[PDB]
DNA sequence: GTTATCCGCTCACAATGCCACACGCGCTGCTCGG
DNA sequence: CCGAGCAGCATACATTACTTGTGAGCGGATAAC
């Protein structure tokens, strides 16, 4: 059901979707969205699980 | 031939010059010495060489803003925005900037030329306003500016001397409030 | 089993790290703009924010 | 297709009275200053 | 050369943070002619 409602189809479309969601109104590039998602997690500094 | 149209960025209160320095440093980082060609922060100088504030003072055309000559590409967009302390762009809808038009460009250019050619004393006096005198010979007098002058800069001022009003040439440094 | 206590040392080091990351940003930008080898690591950082 | 219909989405907007006490209340690098 | 005032600065950022309970306007799905 989720994959049905899932509008996107590709990984880069996932990056741009999450990027727009995080802060609307910004020019979504590959590097911008990719670094944003790699900073939301997968970053020793911007994140830690204690 | 896509020319690098000028653009403007909103800085903080008093970091405009430092923001421009750091922006040139980010240019030298990303080697974008082509796209981010010119970056300018205009200013002015009021030269009142007496009465507290001494010998000069620096103003700005419009504070909080900085002027650049970038181009339009998302990479350069971030490179402008990925600098120490700037707010967003100043123009069209956010994420889609707009250029300061060439008419305004040459206008501000002429203003910059005029302020760069002639360092000129501002904070002038308007004809018909009362004012005290800080002159030696005429200490603690007060009269009305009967006629103002700029290049001669000597303030034709009427004041009560031997009864009836008389015009005097008390220079700027010998002029008190207003 | 899900509610843990947080003592004084833990919160103190938390606030310390918070006050430390901002001086980290400051010293990073000052190392960027500033000279590479002329300094002494005693003024690019300020004890004021800590 | 369109025109009206409806249902989930997001935001505004309320949270008892007193009393007492305590603590604090910008700043900061630019600007006026010698 | 540093001490004493100032002007407009979410400190530049990622700050940030579970349910609170209720009404009300609103935008995308929906039945009908």
């Amino acid at each position: 059901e989720t994959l049905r409602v899932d509008p996107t189809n590709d990984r880069l479309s996932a990056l741009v979707e999450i990027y727009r969601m995080m802060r609307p109104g910004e020019p979504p590039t590959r590097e911008a969205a990719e670094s944003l998602f790699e900073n939301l997690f997968f970053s020793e500094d911007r994140y830690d699980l204690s | 031939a896509p020319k690098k149209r000028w653009y403007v960025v909103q800085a903080f209160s008093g970091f405009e010059g430092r923001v421009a320095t750091s922006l040139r440093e980010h240019i030298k980082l990303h080697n974008m010495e082509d796209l981010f060609g010119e970056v300018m922060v205009p200013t002015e100088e009021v030269v009142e060489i007496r009465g507290g504030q001494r010998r000069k003072s620096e103003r700005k055309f419009f504070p909080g803003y900085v002027l650049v000559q970038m181009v339009m590409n998302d990479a350069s967009w971030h490179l402008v925005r990925s600098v120490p302390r700037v707010m967003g762009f100043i123009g069209g809808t956010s994420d889609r900037p707009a250029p300061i038009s060439d008419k305004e460009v040459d206008a501000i250019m002429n203003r910059l030329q005029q302020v760069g050619d002639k360092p000129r004393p501002k904070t002038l006096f308007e004809p018909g306003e009362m004012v005290r005198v800080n002159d030696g010979p005429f200490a603690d007098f007060n009269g009305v500016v009967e006629e103002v002058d700029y290049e001669k800069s000597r303030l034709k001022v009427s004041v009560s001397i031997f009864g009836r009003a008389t015009p005097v040439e008390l220079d700027f440094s010998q002029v008190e409030k207003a | 089993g899900n509610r843990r206590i947080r003592s004084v040392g833990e919160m103190a080091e938390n606030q310390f790290r918070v006050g430390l990351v901002r001086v980290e940003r400051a010293v990073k930008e000052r190392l960027s703009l500033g000279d590479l080898d002329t300094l002494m690591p005693q003024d690019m950082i300020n004890a004021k924010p800590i």
Side-chain angles (χ1 to χ4, degrees):
Chain A
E1 306 273 355
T2 58
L3 191 135
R4 294 287 160 272
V5 185
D6 178 73
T8 76
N9 66 343
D10 196 355
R11 173 192 205 284
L12 211 61
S13 165
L15 293 201
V16 62
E17 180 42 56
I18 293 300
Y19 187 69
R20 277 164 170 165
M21 175 272 300
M22 171 52 55
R23 30 173 188 160
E26 47 179 359
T29 71
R30 154 158 194 95
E31 43 273 39
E34 195 155 357
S35 316
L36 177 138
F37 191 82
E38 295 300 328
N39 292 317
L40 288 198
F41 314 101
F42 299 95
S43 68
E44 277 276 355
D45 298 14
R46 303 301 290 265
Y47 193 82
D48 180 11
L49 204 50
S50 69
Chain B
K3 197 190 181 64
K4 324 175 296 189
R5 305 156 177 251
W6 276 67
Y7 286 86
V8 59
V9 177
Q10 193 166 212
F12 289 74
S13 158
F15 307 81
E16 319 160 353
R18 287 180 275 171
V19 162
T21 60
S22 44
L23 178 64
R24 300 171 191 104
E25 299 319 304
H26 278 232
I27 293 156
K28 263 167 294 180
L29 159 62
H30 277 76
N31 291 24
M32 309 298 178
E33 285 82 47
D34 49 321
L35 309 187
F36 305 156
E38 192 36 66
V39 52
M40 180 43 65
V41 172
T43 187
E44 298 160 332
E45 299 84 6
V46 183
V47 181
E48 62 279 21
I49 63 184
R50 287 297 94 197
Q53 36 174 5
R54 72 277 195 193
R55 201 57 41 78
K56 77 193 314 299
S57 43
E58 162 147 9
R59 302 313 178 205
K60 310 170 173 296
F61 278 176
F62 34 89
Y65 304 106
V66 292
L67 313 166
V68 303
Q69 198 185 5
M70 73 166 196
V71 304
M72 174 60 171
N73 72 70
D74 308 67
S76 298
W77 188 98
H78 290 68
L79 294 182
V80 175
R81 204 197 194 88
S82 45
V83 299
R85 48 178 63 250
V86 300
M87 276 81 95
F89 274 157
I90 299 296
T93 183
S94 278
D95 88 350
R96 185 47 196 263
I100 171 169
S101 184
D102 198 6
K103 283 202 170 184
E104 318 278 338
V105 163
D106 67 73
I108 209 64
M109 191 62 55
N110 290 24
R111 310 296 163 157
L112 190 57
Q113 265 190 346
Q114 272 98 59
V115 63
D117 297 322
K118 37 196 77 175
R120 293 192 144 281
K122 306 296 103 178
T123 71
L124 54 95
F125 305 132
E126 292 74 4
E129 57 199 359
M130 51 195 187
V131 55
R132 283 189 31 77
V133 181
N134 56 288
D135 168 65
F138 293 83
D140 274 0
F141 280 164
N142 44 1
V144 183
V145 287
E146 201 179 354
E147 163 197 336
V148 74
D149 60 321
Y150 286 158
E151 49 276 10
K152 303 150 292 295
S153 47
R154 225 161 288 103
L155 269 299
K156 182 71 79 64
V157 161
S158 177
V159 60
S160 177
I161 317 294
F162 38 93
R164 50 161 184 196
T166 83
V168 198
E169 202 68 20
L170 301 187
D171 199 300
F172 264 100
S173 158
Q174 292 78 241
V175 191
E176 276 297 332
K177 76 180 184 89
Chain C
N2 302 339
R3 307 184 60 204
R4 77 187 284 270
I5 71 167
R6 199 159 46 200
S7 78
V8 181
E10 189 174 0
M11 308 184 314
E13 70 83 30
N14 274 326
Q15 298 313 123
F16 190 55
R17 188 220 182 278
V18 170
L20 202 44
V21 75
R22 58 188 297 164
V23 313
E24 169 269 345
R25 174 201 294 114
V27 70
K28 178 172 175 305
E29 83 180 338
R30 152 68 190 69
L31 209 63
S32 316
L33 313 173
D35 299 331
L36 285 178
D37 175 66
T38 312
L39 52 86
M40 277 290 158
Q42 269 162 352
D43 48 353
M44 61 298 295
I45 67 170
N46 191 340
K48 154 159 64 79
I50 297 299

